[PDB]
Every structure is written in C-alpha cells, then in structure tokens.
Amino acid sequence: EEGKLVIWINGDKGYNGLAEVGKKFEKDTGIKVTVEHPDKLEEKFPQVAATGDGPDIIFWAHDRFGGYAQSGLLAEITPDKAFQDKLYPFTWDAVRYNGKLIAYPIAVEALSLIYNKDLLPNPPKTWEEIPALDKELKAKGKSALMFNLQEPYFTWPLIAADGGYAFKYENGKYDIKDVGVDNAGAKAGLTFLVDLIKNKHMNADTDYSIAEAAFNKGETAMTINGPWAWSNIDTSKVNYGVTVLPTFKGQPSKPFVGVLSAGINAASPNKELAKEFLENYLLTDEGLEAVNKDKPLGAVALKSYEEELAKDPRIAATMENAQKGEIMPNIPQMSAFWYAVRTAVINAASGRQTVDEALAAAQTHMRLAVARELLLAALEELSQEQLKRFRHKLRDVGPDGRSIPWGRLERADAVDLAEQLAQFYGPEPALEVARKTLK
C-alpha cells in the first residue's frame, strides 16, 4: 500500500494512457503506479475503501462521489488557488460536498444540439423557431427535432431555461428548502414542450431508442444527445454537427453537467503521492493528451488543454453547453427530484395532468420528502436523555384534544416518533410541535 499508487478507472476510459502517465511518474519519482479497471468498481469501492483494501485514487462521475463523501470515504484535497484557477471555476463546484473539495475535476459532459448538415446547414438558435421549421421539413417527409421525452435528464434543459431548477445552489451549498420545479420558468418551459406535442411537432412516446434511430437514418433534422452517442452517428455516416442548444425566451438551455472526477481514498497512506500525481502529472497538457488520445475524454476541465481540444467544434459545443448549464447536484435529495419530475413531464406530455398541476404535484413531493428527512434528522440528533424527556413530554400531545396513539411511547425511537408525528401534523408542523414539546 505505502510507497505505491493504485488507481481505479472505468474500463471504457483511456486507462492505458493513464498508465503511461503513471510510467512517466515512476521514472521521475521511483514510485510505481498501477492502473486497474475492476468490473462495477463504483460498487466495489464503497465496501473495500472503508475496509482498508481499495485503491488510492478512484475516477468516476461526480454524482456518486456525493454518496462516497457522505460516508467519509474521500479525503479532502488541498489544491492552492493557483492550481484551482488553472481549471474552469464551475467544475470545482461539482466536487464540493458540505463545503469541502473532495475530488479533482477531470472531464465535463453535457447535452448538445446535434443536427444534420445536409438537412439543416444552419440550425435554429431558438426553440421558438422549431414549429415553423418542422412544418417545412414535414413537407419533405422529415421532422425538425426528435429527442428522448421519457427521461427528465433530456427534457430539463428546456424546462430550466426560463428559471426552473432542482435545488438552489448558492455559496457553494445546496438549499434543499428552495425547490424550483413549479416556478414560472419551469411552467413556461414545460408548457412550450407540451405545446410542441399538441401541435404534432413531437410525439409524447419518443424515447432514447426511437430518437437515435430516427436521427441516424436521416429522418429527423435534429436531436438532443451527448458525446456517448457520437460514435453511433459516426457509424451511420450522417453528416452531423454538434452545436449550442437553442435558447428559450432569450435564455440558454441549461443541461445537467456531469464531471468525471478523481477522488483520493480517505484510508490511503499515499495522499501526498496521489495529490502530486494528479496535479503535476495527470492534470497537465501532456497527461491529459496521453489519456485523451487513447480514448477521448471529451471536454476537459484544464483550460489550457481544453482550448486545444476545442479545435473540434463538437467538443467546443459540449463545453459551451456545459458552461451555460447547471452542475448535476450530488446531494441525496435528488432522488426525490428524479422521481417527481419524471412523473410530471410524462403526465403533462400525455394530457393526464395540466402543466400547472403536474409541476405543483412534483413540487409537493420533493418538499414533503425533504420535510420528512428534516423531521427525522432533528429527532435523531437528540441524546438518549433528551429523547427520554421528549417521550414523556409527548404524552397527552395530539390534535383536537385527542392524544396520538402510541404502542409504547416511552420506548418509541426517532423513526417511530417522526413518522407518527408527520402523519398527524404534516412533516413541517411536526417539527415545530417537536420543538415546542421540549420547551
């Protein structure tokens, strides 16, 4: 373990180029660096890192690093402001969890507008032009745009364009009490999407497979997709371009941003060697180039090498849409976001719910789920004697002069108390009831 670096990276990345970086790192310092790509390493890491047996460095999308950092499995990195300013500022937000930097950002991915140059040499700059564009291409048997409408990941760029957001991100922190899925911007975006469906410009049943097949066979002029899809379009011999997403009401589309990141194992005995390898060997032009020409990293976080990589207009498009988009939040509450919004968009796209009631319902679910988590957290942090006095002060408590029924109140733990109080008072007023009970 000591005096040696073990790096875990997914097998679909340029791990041989990373090994070349480790080889230059060895001949400069004498420290051996071995790169491995275990199967389902993102699931093996949380069990072998706390156990004491895993890698020193793990490369993965920043979304899973939030769960890792919640378990204390990632060490807090210490790059000075000089090294931080060498990377794009927004990429640093993707590797922050409860204020602490937990990883180095490596590469950046985001949705972009993919268009067929033979069908559409000049793609539209606004969503507003799409209806008139579709009516023209429909005369030739084509359609303007097809993309996956079944997953909020793909429809959120339009919904967030005019002001929708999952949780407010300010001062390097997410405010889980500021949910923006039912504000006026999200309504305007979803209304425009539904209007496209009603006016037959889109079909509510289009999924990822149908959209990809239709674009790669020249049937539609545009699709919305990421770099993972480029290889299939390369096979299809479609003459395609990758460009900035259309604006809506003058505001850019805001796709979710994924940041491939390098985290240092908290149980590693080579944190200093890892930091030296990542800052001075990997995150340089030479190291990124060695990795990228093995398998392309896409848009990278290192400014100097991203200018060189942006000579490919497709990578420039990815980075541009990334800078205009929003970092994918790495907090656990996003589980309520994905469930709620996926239902709302599908129901609104079908006409089972209006846009207003679909977004309202999604807003309530996320809000009530957060409130129940906050009620439990407030009750679980009480000491055993605080909990004891809380239990006894809880007797005779109940709405309408009827005390809440408990099986054995004097031994009801936090989970029982929180769930039962939430059912009788709502999750938010149960918290004020819990506080007033003590005082």
PDB file of N, CA and C in Angstrom, residues 247-293:
ATOM      1  N   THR A 247     -31.954  28.638 -27.494  1.00  0.00           N
ATOM      2  CA  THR A 247     -32.428  29.434 -26.377  1.00  0.00           C
ATOM      3  C   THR A 247     -33.947  29.340 -26.273  1.00  0.00           C
ATOM      4  N   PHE A 248     -34.463  29.699 -25.101  1.00  0.00           N
ATOM      5  CA  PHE A 248     -35.900  29.794 -24.872  1.00  0.00           C
ATOM      6  C   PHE A 248     -36.183  31.102 -24.154  1.00  0.00           C
ATOM      7  N   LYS A 249     -37.019  31.943 -24.768  1.00  0.00           N
ATOM      8  CA  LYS A 249     -37.313  33.282 -24.258  1.00  0.00           C
ATOM      9  C   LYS A 249     -36.026  34.066 -24.014  1.00  0.00           C
ATOM     10  N   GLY A 250     -35.054  33.879 -24.907  1.00  0.00           N
ATOM     11  CA  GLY A 250     -33.788  34.579 -24.833  1.00  0.00           C
ATOM     12  C   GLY A 250     -32.787  34.020 -23.846  1.00  0.00           C
ATOM     13  N   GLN A 251     -33.129  32.953 -23.121  1.00  0.00           N
ATOM     14  CA  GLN A 251     -32.217  32.360 -22.156  1.00  0.00           C
ATOM     15  C   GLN A 251     -31.692  31.025 -22.667  1.00  0.00           C
ATOM     16  N   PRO A 252     -30.433  30.698 -22.394  1.00  0.00           N
ATOM     17  CA  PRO A 252     -29.881  29.432 -22.885  1.00  0.00           C
ATOM     18  C   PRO A 252     -30.542  28.226 -22.235  1.00  0.00           C
ATOM     19  N   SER A 253     -30.565  27.125 -22.981  1.00  0.00           N
ATOM     20  CA  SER A 253     -30.907  25.840 -22.391  1.00  0.00           C
ATOM     21  C   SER A 253     -29.837  25.457 -21.378  1.00  0.00           C
ATOM     22  N   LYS A 254     -30.264  24.839 -20.274  1.00  0.00           N
ATOM     23  CA  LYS A 254     -29.387  24.549 -19.141  1.00  0.00           C
ATOM     24  C   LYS A 254     -29.358  23.044 -18.902  1.00  0.00           C
ATOM     25  N   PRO A 255     -28.553  22.308 -19.663  1.00  0.00           N
ATOM     26  CA  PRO A 255     -28.425  20.871 -19.417  1.00  0.00           C
ATOM     27  C   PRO A 255     -27.692  20.598 -18.112  1.00  0.00           C
ATOM     28  N   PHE A 256     -27.949  19.414 -17.563  1.00  0.00           N
ATOM     29  CA  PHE A 256     -27.193  18.963 -16.404  1.00  0.00           C
ATOM     30  C   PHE A 256     -25.768  18.617 -16.818  1.00  0.00           C
ATOM     31  N   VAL A 257     -24.814  18.969 -15.962  1.00  0.00           N
ATOM     32  CA  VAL A 257     -23.393  18.807 -16.243  1.00  0.00           C
ATOM     33  C   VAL A 257     -22.862  17.646 -15.415  1.00  0.00           C
ATOM     34  N   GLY A 258     -22.202  16.707 -16.082  1.00  0.00           N
ATOM     35  CA  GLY A 258     -21.506  15.611 -15.426  1.00  0.00           C
ATOM     36  C   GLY A 258     -20.010  15.861 -15.480  1.00  0.00           C
ATOM     37  N   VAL A 259     -19.342  15.643 -14.352  1.00  0.00           N
ATOM     38  CA  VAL A 259     -17.919  15.928 -14.212  1.00  0.00           C
ATOM     39  C   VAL A 259     -17.220  14.654 -13.764  1.00  0.00           C
ATOM     40  N   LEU A 260     -16.493  14.023 -14.682  1.00  0.00           N
ATOM     41  CA  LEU A 260     -15.596  12.938 -14.306  1.00  0.00           C
ATOM     42  C   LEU A 260     -14.528  13.478 -13.369  1.00  0.00           C
ATOM     43  N   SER A 261     -14.398  12.859 -12.198  1.00  0.00           N
ATOM     44  CA  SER A 261     -13.552  13.393 -11.144  1.00  0.00           C
ATOM     45  C   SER A 261     -12.636  12.307 -10.598  1.00  0.00           C
ATOM     46  N   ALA A 262     -11.542  12.749  -9.983  1.00  0.00           N
ATOM     47  CA  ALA A 262     -10.557  11.863  -9.376  1.00  0.00           C
ATOM     48  C   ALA A 262     -10.539  12.127  -7.878  1.00  0.00           C
ATOM     49  N   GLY A 263     -11.023  11.164  -7.102  1.00  0.00           N
ATOM     50  CA  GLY A 263     -11.050  11.267  -5.656  1.00  0.00           C
ATOM     51  C   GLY A 263      -9.949  10.442  -5.013  1.00  0.00           C
ATOM     52  N   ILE A 264      -9.460  10.925  -3.876  1.00  0.00           N
ATOM     53  CA  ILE A 264      -8.383  10.272  -3.142  1.00  0.00           C
ATOM     54  C   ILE A 264      -8.987   9.538  -1.952  1.00  0.00           C
ATOM     55  N   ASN A 265      -8.706   8.239  -1.864  1.00  0.00           N
ATOM     56  CA  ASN A 265      -9.232   7.407  -0.788  1.00  0.00           C
ATOM     57  C   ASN A 265      -8.845   7.980   0.569  1.00  0.00           C
ATOM     58  N   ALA A 266      -9.836   8.105   1.456  1.00  0.00           N
ATOM     59  CA  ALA A 266      -9.567   8.632   2.788  1.00  0.00           C
ATOM     60  C   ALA A 266      -8.646   7.713   3.577  1.00  0.00           C
ATOM     61  N   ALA A 267      -8.731   6.406   3.338  1.00  0.00           N
ATOM     62  CA  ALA A 267      -7.881   5.429   4.001  1.00  0.00           C
ATOM     63  C   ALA A 267      -6.553   5.221   3.283  1.00  0.00           C
ATOM     64  N   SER A 268      -6.236   6.052   2.296  1.00  0.00           N
ATOM     65  CA  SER A 268      -4.986   5.891   1.571  1.00  0.00           C
ATOM     66  C   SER A 268      -3.811   6.365   2.423  1.00  0.00           C
ATOM     67  N   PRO A 269      -2.699   5.634   2.420  1.00  0.00           N
ATOM     68  CA  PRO A 269      -1.459   6.139   3.024  1.00  0.00           C
ATOM     69  C   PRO A 269      -0.570   6.928   2.073  1.00  0.00           C
ATOM     70  N   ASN A 270      -1.032   7.206   0.855  1.00  0.00           N
ATOM     71  CA  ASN A 270      -0.265   7.933  -0.150  1.00  0.00           C
ATOM     72  C   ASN A 270      -1.063   9.116  -0.679  1.00  0.00           C
ATOM     73  N   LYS A 271      -1.675   9.880   0.232  1.00  0.00           N
ATOM     74  CA  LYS A 271      -2.432  11.056  -0.184  1.00  0.00           C
ATOM     75  C   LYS A 271      -1.527  12.085  -0.849  1.00  0.00           C
ATOM     76  N   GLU A 272      -0.307  12.250  -0.330  1.00  0.00           N
ATOM     77  CA  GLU A 272       0.622  13.215  -0.907  1.00  0.00           C
ATOM     78  C   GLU A 272       1.090  12.769  -2.287  1.00  0.00           C
ATOM     79  N   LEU A 273       1.370  11.473  -2.449  1.00  0.00           N
ATOM     80  CA  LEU A 273       1.747  10.952  -3.760  1.00  0.00           C
ATOM     81  C   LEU A 273       0.597  11.074  -4.751  1.00  0.00           C
ATOM     82  N   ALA A 274      -0.630  10.803  -4.299  1.00  0.00           N
ATOM     83  CA  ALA A 274      -1.795  10.953  -5.164  1.00  0.00           C
ATOM     84  C   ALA A 274      -1.959  12.400  -5.608  1.00  0.00           C
ATOM     85  N   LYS A 275      -1.891  13.335  -4.657  1.00  0.00           N
ATOM     86  CA  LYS A 275      -2.004  14.751  -4.993  1.00  0.00           C
ATOM     87  C   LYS A 275      -0.927  15.174  -5.983  1.00  0.00           C
ATOM     88  N   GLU A 276       0.309  14.714  -5.774  1.00  0.00           N
ATOM     89  CA  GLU A 276       1.392  15.057  -6.692  1.00  0.00           C
ATOM     90  C   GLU A 276       1.146  14.472  -8.077  1.00  0.00           C
ATOM     91  N   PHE A 277       0.655  13.232  -8.138  1.00  0.00           N
ATOM     92  CA  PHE A 277       0.373  12.613  -9.429  1.00  0.00           C
ATOM     93  C   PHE A 277      -0.737  13.350 -10.170  1.00  0.00           C
ATOM     94  N   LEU A 278      -1.805  13.728  -9.465  1.00  0.00           N
ATOM     95  CA  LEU A 278      -2.957  14.310 -10.145  1.00  0.00           C
ATOM     96  C   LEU A 278      -2.674  15.735 -10.598  1.00  0.00           C
ATOM     97  N   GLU A 279      -2.031  16.534  -9.746  1.00  0.00           N
ATOM     98  CA  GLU A 279      -1.846  17.946 -10.054  1.00  0.00           C
ATOM     99  C   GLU A 279      -0.716  18.169 -11.054  1.00  0.00           C
ATOM    100  N   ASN A 280       0.390  17.442 -10.914  1.00  0.00           N
ATOM    101  CA  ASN A 280       1.601  17.729 -11.667  1.00  0.00           C
ATOM    102  C   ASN A 280       1.904  16.718 -12.765  1.00  0.00           C
ATOM    103  N   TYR A 281       1.076  15.687 -12.940  1.00  0.00           N
ATOM    104  CA  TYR A 281       1.337  14.707 -13.988  1.00  0.00           C
ATOM    105  C   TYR A 281       0.092  14.434 -14.823  1.00  0.00           C
ATOM    106  N   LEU A 282      -1.044  14.188 -14.170  1.00  0.00           N
ATOM    107  CA  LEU A 282      -2.277  13.957 -14.916  1.00  0.00           C
ATOM    108  C   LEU A 282      -2.876  15.266 -15.420  1.00  0.00           C
ATOM    109  N   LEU A 283      -3.224  16.168 -14.503  1.00  0.00           N
ATOM    110  CA  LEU A 283      -3.891  17.408 -14.882  1.00  0.00           C
ATOM    111  C   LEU A 283      -2.920  18.408 -15.498  1.00  0.00           C
ATOM    112  N   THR A 284      -2.174  17.961 -16.503  1.00  0.00           N
ATOM    113  CA  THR A 284      -1.363  18.814 -17.353  1.00  0.00           C
ATOM    114  C   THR A 284      -1.733  18.521 -18.802  1.00  0.00           C
ATOM    115  N   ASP A 285      -1.197  19.330 -19.719  1.00  0.00           N
ATOM    116  CA  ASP A 285      -1.453  19.095 -21.136  1.00  0.00           C
ATOM    117  C   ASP A 285      -0.926  17.734 -21.571  1.00  0.00           C
ATOM    118  N   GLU A 286       0.270  17.369 -21.107  1.00  0.00           N
ATOM    119  CA  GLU A 286       0.889  16.112 -21.515  1.00  0.00           C
ATOM    120  C   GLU A 286       0.100  14.917 -20.997  1.00  0.00           C
ATOM    121  N   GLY A 287      -0.289  14.953 -19.721  1.00  0.00           N
ATOM    122  CA  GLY A 287      -1.016  13.833 -19.146  1.00  0.00           C
ATOM    123  C   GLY A 287      -2.416  13.685 -19.712  1.00  0.00           C
ATOM    124  N   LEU A 288      -3.141  14.799 -19.850  1.00  0.00           N
ATOM    125  CA  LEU A 288      -4.479  14.738 -20.431  1.00  0.00           C
ATOM    126  C   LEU A 288      -4.430  14.272 -21.879  1.00  0.00           C
ATOM    127  N   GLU A 289      -3.417  14.710 -22.629  1.00  0.00           N
ATOM    128  CA  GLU A 289      -3.288  14.279 -24.018  1.00  0.00           C
ATOM    129  C   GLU A 289      -3.011  12.784 -24.104  1.00  0.00           C
ATOM    130  N   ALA A 290      -2.161  12.269 -23.212  1.00  0.00           N
ATOM    131  CA  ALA A 290      -1.877  10.838 -23.204  1.00  0.00           C
ATOM    132  C   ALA A 290      -3.141  10.027 -22.946  1.00  0.00           C
ATOM    133  N   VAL A 291      -3.983  10.484 -22.017  1.00  0.00           N
ATOM    134  CA  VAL A 291      -5.240   9.794 -21.742  1.00  0.00           C
ATOM    135  C   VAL A 291      -6.215   9.970 -22.900  1.00  0.00           C
ATOM    136  N   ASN A 292      -6.295  11.184 -23.450  1.00  0.00           N
ATOM    137  CA  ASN A 292      -7.349  11.501 -24.409  1.00  0.00           C
ATOM    138  C   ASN A 292      -7.140  10.791 -25.741  1.00  0.00           C
ATOM    139  N   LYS A 293      -5.895  10.696 -26.212  1.00  0.00           N
ATOM    140  CA  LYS A 293      -5.661  10.039 -27.493  1.00  0.00           C
ATOM    141  C   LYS A 293      -5.762   8.521 -27.406  1.00  0.00           C
TER     142      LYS A 293
END
